[PDB]
Amino acid sequence: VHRLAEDFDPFQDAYMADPAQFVRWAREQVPIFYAPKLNYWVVTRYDTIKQIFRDPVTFSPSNVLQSFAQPSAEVRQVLERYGYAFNRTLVNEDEPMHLERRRVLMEPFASEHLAEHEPMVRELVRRAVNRFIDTGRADLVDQMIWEVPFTVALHFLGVDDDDREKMRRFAIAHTVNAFGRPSPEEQLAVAETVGQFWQFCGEVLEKMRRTADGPGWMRYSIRQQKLYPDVVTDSYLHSMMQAIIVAAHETTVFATTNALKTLLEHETVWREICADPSLIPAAAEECLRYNGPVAGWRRRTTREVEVEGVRLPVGANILMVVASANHDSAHFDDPEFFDIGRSNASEHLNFGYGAHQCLGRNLGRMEMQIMIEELSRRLPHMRLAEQRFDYLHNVSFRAPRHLWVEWDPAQNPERRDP
Template sequence: MDPSRSGAGCPASRIAAEFDPFGDAYQEDPAALLAAARAEEPVFYSPELDHWVVTRYRDVKEFFRDTKRFSASNALEPITPLGEKARARLAEYDFAPGPVLVNEDEPVHMRRRKRLAPPLAAEEVAKLEGRIRDLVSSYVDAFVARGTADLIDDLLWEVPAIVGLLVCGVPDEDIDRARHYTIKMGMFTWGKPTEEHQVEIADQVGQWWRLSGQLVDRLKREGGQGWVPTAIDVHRDDPELVDDNHLQNMMMSGLVAAHETTTNATANALRFLLSQRDSWEELCADPALIPNAVEECLRFRASVQCWRRKALVDVEVEGVTIPAGSRVLLVIGSGNHDETVFDNPQELDIHRPNAKRHLAFGMGAHACIGAPLARLEMRIILEELTRRLPHMRLVDGQDFGYLHNASFHGPRHLRVEWEPADNPVDA
């Protein structure tokens, strides 16, 4: 790709040359790092990634919605190409996933989506509220008398994984087995792992792929309820639309879609709400404010910072031509901080009237079908923590750690402390 075609027409535009989505400055505040791009060079070519980077709200939204000029086929490709050893390790597990919803194009995508999405509709996932609340309560019970916790290790890593398995229809005893396999797929797809680390991740991916096949086989034999069992019904009715490979991949990637995204979104929300004490206290005093706070947190610090498309034709945008065949990085986190859509975007405002216009779940034909579930989990976790640990505070001076990931965004640790003697509710 010729970098002279970058936005400003400059062969080495400063913005393009400095853009490093794995670097510390980006991890610290992706939207702030791209403020200059939004203002001066809203679309630029990144030689580092070999992707065109799109930063303004209107363009990110438009590209998401345009299924004629953009393909979703590259959505799950590792952004750092896999080395030979990692590919060989995956082959040992017969790892050969075909497309699922997220990386399938029209017209097949919509035919499948119509059949597969109903179990994740808001009215269906609302039925899980009691079970999710019990699960969250049991995790909080385990640390509430301790006075300190790492909210990632003690709550936020496991709960969305278990809920994901539950939604996929995995029986209780298999949930226990499967939760140990939950893998950091974000690193596989969006990270910059060393060759050795790639092999380690490939091993986990391979094991999870294999186990996903076994879980599907059991559901086929014994039946069940939920997202994958519904897909098994569709498979029996129309095996061409949903084949065996699709079922196995759906189990595998469905859990990934449901897990780290929600862990990071909730961790980001808690990190920033606890950093802004008056907002946290408002939520403790009036939990009815939590749903809008969830939207604002998703806007303020999206857990999926970027998504991808491939241009099917030459596309003119913001005075730049993106050539057919190019890969495009849609920076959701930057669009969510676009000054033309959100007033004072760098401010976390739990009362923001248009918070819900964020792009955290994508937009259009591929918009996240798990959004109602993610919102439900985030609301319940915030409700339970504001109710039981309103006096919780972030441990001063802690290092949240970075994931060094171009898209999946959240702290590695979230250490909090409180006086157990002041707990308003007993375990």
């Protein structure tokens, strides 16, 4: 138990594939421990994690997007060449300004406004499945799930048709760079893309200011800046395109990939949702609890504070193993039961809790639900193919990189006889 704390290393297959099992020892008997390989304190229980999320002044989100790689002089030089001035934009932003900015920018995330995006999501998903449904073997990640949430994010922002086509090359992987230990080479490749995207978005922001009464979050926020000029700076608005894409893209990809893996691995449940699609919203919620995209999330203390009887110093790094909380028998009855009927499944912590709780969570849920319904209606007869599941190593987000499935196209429901 002393040994497991000293040896704690999340940069390995077992933490990525099943973090809740990997730390079950700690959830059961060691609710806080220091991990000297990380210089992080690690918490694993549902109520400890809710307590930390509940106080954003004591427990700052300043380290949420902090890379574990050693810092890069070449990275800084590339970003300064492009005039990069990305702000800490909501997810890792401190009080008091975070809640003031969330108050003025949150309206377009309301369920009533996200409802306008539903036809576009349905069309993207139908068009993606059309491109592979007649083949009989496909990787659901590379052949649909990767791209759909990137395009959805650009629609939520209000990016115009020509600009979305020019943005295809910016749909890169950010998870290892922000939450893991990228090589010097990967760090520099991401920096170059980020700087180029900063330049591209400066130009999009001028155009959006010319059509400020048009649709989407960016134009909403430009109109809010006119009402609250001392709350919304120009560089914060410039930062909002990247912030939303990072927030909305791989999160949703990982959630959907995991949900499909779990539903196909639990064949009786796949059969149930193929028979009764009204079960899909609740099923997607239990997928988030049982096999969610968030392994871990982070905070840094701003004052000495007692957590589980241990007084942490100022500036202490905390890893909250959200997947462990989501498997915690002290909150979830029979947590190893994958139960799509679970009434409290939405009490999972993949969207956080409290002041920074995910603003886009209902759009993420809608995308998951539409992708599951399209595949259960048009490919009920598919099955997971034999394959190895590989996870990129990082502290926060987990999903297999590929998800191969196979089926008989002649038995597709849209071709099958009555």
